[PDB]
Amino acid sequence: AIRKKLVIVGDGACGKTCLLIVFSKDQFPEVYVPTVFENYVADIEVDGKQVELALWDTAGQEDYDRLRPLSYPDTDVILMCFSIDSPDSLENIPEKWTPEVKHFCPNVPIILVGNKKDLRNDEHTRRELAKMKQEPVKPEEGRDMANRIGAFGYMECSAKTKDGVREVFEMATRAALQA
Amino acid sequence: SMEMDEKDFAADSWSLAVDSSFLQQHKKEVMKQQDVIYELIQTELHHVRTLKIMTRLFRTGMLEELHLEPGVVQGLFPCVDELSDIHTRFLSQLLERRRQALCPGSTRNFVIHRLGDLLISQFSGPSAEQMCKTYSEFCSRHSKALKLYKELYARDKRFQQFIRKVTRPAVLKRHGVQECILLVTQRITKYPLLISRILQHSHGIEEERQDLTTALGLVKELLSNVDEGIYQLEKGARLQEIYNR
Numbered sequence: 001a002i003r004k005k006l007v008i009v010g011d012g013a014c015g016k017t018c019l020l021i022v023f024s025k026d027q028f029p030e031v032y033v034p035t036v037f038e039n040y041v042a043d044i045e046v047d048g049k050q051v052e053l054a055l056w057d058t059a060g061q062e063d064y065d066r067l068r069p070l071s072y073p074d075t076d077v078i079l080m081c082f083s084i085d086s087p088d089s090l091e092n093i094p095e096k097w098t099p100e101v102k103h104f105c106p107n108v109p110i111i112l113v114g115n116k117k118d119l120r121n122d123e124h125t126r127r128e129l130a131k132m133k134q135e136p137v138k139p140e141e142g143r144d145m146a147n148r149i150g151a152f153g154y155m156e157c158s159a160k161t162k163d164g165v166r167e168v169f170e171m172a173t174r175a176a177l178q179a
Numbered sequence: 180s181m182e183m184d185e186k187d188f189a190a191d192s193w194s195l196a197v198d199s200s201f202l203q204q205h206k207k208e209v210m211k212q213q214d215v216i217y218e219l220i221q222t223e224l225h226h227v228r229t230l231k232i233m234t235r236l237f238r239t240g241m242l243e244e245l246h247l248e249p250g251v252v253q254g255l256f257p258c259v260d261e262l263s264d265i266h267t268r269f270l271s272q273l274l275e276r277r278r279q280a281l282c283p284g285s286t287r288n289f290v291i292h293r294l295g296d297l298l299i300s301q302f303s304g305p306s307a308e309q310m311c312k313t314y315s316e317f318c319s320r321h322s323k324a325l326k327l328y329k330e331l332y333a334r335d336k337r338f339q340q341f342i343r344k345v346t347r348p349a350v351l352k353r354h355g356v357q358e359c360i361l362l363v364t365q366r367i368t369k370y371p372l373l374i375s376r377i378l379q380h381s382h383g384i385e386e387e388r389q390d391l392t393t394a395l396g397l398v399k400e401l402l403s404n405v406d407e408g409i410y411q412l413e414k415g416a417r418l419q420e421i422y423n424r
């Protein structure tokens with residue numbers, strides 16, 4: 001088994017801590033959802049190759065521009081997250097997060113991940129967003145942003161229902177294994 | 180970690196740690212507050228444990244088994260004794276607050292009603308000055324520590340055998356040298372997230388809400404101060420590179 005490093009970036013409420021928790025426990029916690037994620041080394045086998053994938057979070061580091069880049073050394077794959085219930089989180093992807101990740105992680109593949117895909121068909125989400133002349137992020141809007149920023153690929157998932165979670169991490173492992 | 184503390188923090192939550200007959204005696208809001216307080220202490224216990232792996236397993240093991248040049252072990256593990264002293268003292272206070280609150284005849288049933296004052300004390304005065312000084316120094320030597328580690332693992336056979344040997348057990352899966360350094364760096368930015376969620380469930384007593392609001396403010400002041408005192412040290416950097424920053 002080869003060792004690879006994954007770091008997830010994105011705005012404070014993009015759901016990146018919940019995504020790492022649900023993958024690492026292989027379950028959406030029934031009793032208590034942790035506030036924070038320390039780290040984890042997942043055993044993953046993708047396309048016949050065994051990899052130990054170390055998982056890291058940047059939650060808490062969003063307002064600290066000198067502490068945050070300390071998470072980036074030797075990263076093999078980046079998961080750049082946004083929340084599908086928050087079109088404002090997608091707007092900050094090319095403005096702030098993309099120039100940062102391209103500077104500290106040159107040539108590292110980036111996967112743009114649309115989180116909370118379950119809220120696209122949530123009536124409370126739809127009513128709330130319509131009060132700010134908005135709607136949940138459309139699948140094509142996510143694909144077009146990933147295409148624009150030079151992402152390796154675009155994926156969607158729901159940490160709440162577990163749908164798409166496993167696929168994101170197996171694909172991240174494949175991206176980390178490339179050239 | 181010592182067995183007593185591991186068992187006390189073995190459950191995924193406070194609600195699963197206490198007896199179900201004790202849990203039934205509390206309101207939902209108190210259970211939600213206690214779950215986040217337990218998470219802060221359980222994560223502090225693991226953080227102190229990361230610092231013990233760095234001092235006792237790695238640092239001390241290199242001094243007693245390997246022949247490294249003077250100042251090499253200090254460059255790999257900067258400020259580890261200082262960090263261990265800050266967090267072991269903070270952990271002793273959190274664990275004593277839990278113990279004092281235990282019901283007579285119980286080693287697991289407790290409720291912590293007054294965490295705010297302990298957090299204001301930790302993130303103010305001399306102990307806050309020491310946290311600021313130590314993390315400003317540690318985080319500025321983080322990249323130099325990583326580059327020094329990689330050089331040693333790649334060029335020294337005895338160093339590579341030492342690492343592979345002490346990191347072989349499964350309990351050390353998440354705690355390699357580089358992983359311990361990033362765990363320590365990320366610890367300080369975990370504090371506002373935990374404190375804000377404790378605050379969200381601490382409106383019952385106006386005094387407690389005020390103390391947690393003050394402590395959250397002090398933690399943010401500390402983080403802003405540490406963030407501004409960081410400049411990555413580079414081995415072999417020339418003065419011209421430094422003053423042209």
Ligand SMILES: Cc1[nH]ncc1C1CCNCC1
Nearest residue numbers: 065066069099100101103104
């Ligand atoms: C240099 C730096 N520190 N924190 C963030 C940054 C970015 C990197 C990408 N370009 C703008 C500054």
